[PDB]
């Protein structure tokens, strides 16, 4: 991929967090804290999951951004719109205004409805994302095997803007505690 020319500087925003989430000064690394995070409540926090967007909105163009996955045993990344339900029990999907893969439990999958198995040889470190918004095309790929593709959603129905999207996972295990962390370009 030749994307890397299309590079984002993206930023979390600290108001659509979920309240146990600690955003960096910088507000380029998310990790789940112990607790509850000493926050308000208010309606663009994700209630029920560790999730977070980015500050940036996108209608158009092409736009690319890395994200450092080392050491988490569970994640989901991609795209979702500005619409998207905050509060309650939801499916990461495209018919919930989600375009997203994850790692759970050992496997790599591509957040359609069910779920899509991906084939990726090398275990990533760091994931890059490019949506083409007039295409309708949100894509990955695996940065710690020299790009090489691992998901493509086309025909995308993004219905309005987009937002960066984040889940840094629960730690039940004492094993995710580590952040996500926004790659320098
Ligand atoms: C079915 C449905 N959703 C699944 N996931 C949502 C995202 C995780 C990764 C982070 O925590 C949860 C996986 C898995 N299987």
Partial sequence: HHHHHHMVHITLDRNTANSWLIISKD???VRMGDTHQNVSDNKERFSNYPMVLGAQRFSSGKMYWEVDVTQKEAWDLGVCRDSVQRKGQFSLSPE???WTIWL???????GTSPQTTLHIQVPPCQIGIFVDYEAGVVSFYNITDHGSLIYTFSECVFAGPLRPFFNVGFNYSGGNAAPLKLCPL
């Fill in 27 to 29: 507000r380029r690394q």
């Fill in 96 to 98: 919930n205004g989600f």
């Fill in 104 to 110: 759970w439990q050992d496997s790599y999958e591509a």
